[PDB]
Amino acid sequence: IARTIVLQESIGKGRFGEVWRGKWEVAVKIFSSREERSWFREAEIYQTVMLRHENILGFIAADNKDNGTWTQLWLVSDYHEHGSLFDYLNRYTVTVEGMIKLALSTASGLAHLHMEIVGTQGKPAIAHRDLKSKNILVKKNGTCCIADLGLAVRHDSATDTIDRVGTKRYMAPEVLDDSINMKHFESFKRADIYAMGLVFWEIARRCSIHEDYQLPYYDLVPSDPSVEEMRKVVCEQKLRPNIPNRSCEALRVMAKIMRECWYANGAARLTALRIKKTLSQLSQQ
């Protein structure tokens, strides 16, 4: 695997690890030996039984590569020329149909992650914990696939047990004020929903008349905001990304979804499955 891959271009970096475009085209994330725990954990999540799905980054393999001086810890995946949704939305505007495709595919991927699949070759429910436009990738066919599962948590339904991290800007209210129950898997699922809502906001702005690209809370917090800065806005002032006045039926549906993803109480939010259904219906209309 790694033995026969030739790196060609530096294309980014994760929380840990540098991302490269290589030829085996494939994407490669390289970690140093001191980052073994992060490398292993993400490898572990990607190797979960029945995890593969069209809206989840396609994992190829985890490997080691000794260059003669030091050993590199590798994770290899499919390569998508468009890269992140973040980059995609900055570079282009989208049609109503394109917006629906991006939102539906993301929701379909999160629903798959959240969904426990019962059976001999079953899949446990999984919560992402760091969903953002920067780790969702856009495929050539206009659909998304979710990446970086290194902070994910897996649920054992038989015992309701699992096996402050994350991107500040996208942290759920309960995470920002630390009221979230770290022992309650469902709470992590709900927190993902809040984040996906913000992502939907980023996409809707680009649906073209249209708004320029912006990260959520762009006009309320500084870049690389701290937990406190976020908490004051989201928890104390209780603000959420602004919903433009103009409206289209599709955009109206999106906005409603957003609002229902932004409740301070996770238990009040919509589920990924419900969002997928609603988006599916809209796509048909």
Ligand SMILES: Cc1cccc(-c2nc(Nc3ccc4[nH]ncc4c3)c3ccccc3n2)n1
């Ligand atoms: C498990 C794994 C293997 C390889 C790369 C990543 C990865 N990639 C990111 N970015 C990225 C950028 C452009 C791309 N084109 N085709 C694929 C692709 C991937 C990440 C960005 C943020 C956090 C983690 C990432 N992990 N994860």
